[PDB]
Amino acid sequence: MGKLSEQLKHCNGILKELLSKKHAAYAWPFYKPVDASALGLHDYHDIIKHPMDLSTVKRKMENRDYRDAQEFAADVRLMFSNCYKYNPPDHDVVAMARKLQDVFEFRYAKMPD
Ligand SMILES: CNC(=O)c1cc(C(=O)N[C@H]2[C@@H]3COC[C@@H]32)cc2c1O[C@H](CF)[C@H]2c1ccccc1
């Protein structure tokens, strides 16, 4: 029950919230890796070097891959950054990213010290 454990429990709580029915209307594009081929996005992997999605964050959390809150937050923000890099700012998925990042940032800010 040390500080790192406690901070990663807060991260795990946020992760569960981002995956919850409450946010499903705007979270769903981030549930699984972007299927570039299926979506016809044949330039996706040329523009996005480091893909990230919530299923990958969940696997890394379950595998105890994250050693601290900062490492977890870096993956969640990489996921949003990839969305803002690849997509025109007027696309629905960017509006959805902004809304889910608002949920993330406000709760991440309530990290226990
Ligand atoms: C992280 N997800 C994505 O970046 C993403 C990109 C595109 C896309 O087609 N992006 C291309 C825009 C126009 O050309 C470059 C960018 C489409 C969708 C995406 O997530 C959903 C699939 F999970 C799918 C979606 C469908 C309808 C509404 C919202 C989201």
UniProtKB/Swiss-Prot annotation:
The first bromo domain specifically recognizes histone H4 acetylated at 'Lys-12' (H4K12ac). It also specifically binds histone H4 acetyl-methylated at 'Lys-5' and 'Lys-12' (H4K5acme and H4K12acme, respectively). The second bromo domain recognizes and binds histone H4 acetylated at 'Lys-5' and 'Lys-12' (H4K5ac and H4K12ac, respectively). Residues 2-111 form the Bromo domain. It comes from Homo sapiens. Belongs to the BET family. It is found in: Nucleus; Chromosome. The chain holds residues 344 to 455 of 801 of the full protein. Homodimer. Interacts with E2F1. Interacts with (acetylated) STAT3; promoting STAT3 recruitment to chromatin. Interacts with CTCF; promoting BRD2 recruitment to chromatin. (Microbial infection) Interacts with herpes virus 8 protein LANA1. This is Bromodomain-containing protein 2. Changing L41A: Reduced binding to histone H4 acetylated at 'Lys-12' (H4K12ac). Chromatin reader protein that specifically recognizes and binds histone H4 acetylated at 'Lys-5' and 'Lys-12' (H4K5ac and H4K12ac, respectively), thereby controlling gene expression and remodeling chromatin structures. Recruits transcription factors and coactivators to target gene sites, and activates RNA polymerase II machinery for transcriptional elongation. Changing L39A: Reduced binding to histone H4 acetylated at 'Lys-12' (H4K12ac). Some specific inhibitors of BRD2 that prevent binding to acetylated histone are promising therapeutic molecules for the treatment of cancers or inflammatory diseases. ABBV-744, a small molecule, has been tested on tumors with success: ABBV-744 antiproliferative activity is mainly restricted to cell lines of acute myeloid leukaemia and prostate cancer and is able to displace BRD4 from chromatin. GSK046 (iBET-BD2), which specifically inhibits the second bromo domain, is a promising therapeutic small molecule for the treatment of inflammatory and autoimmune diseases.
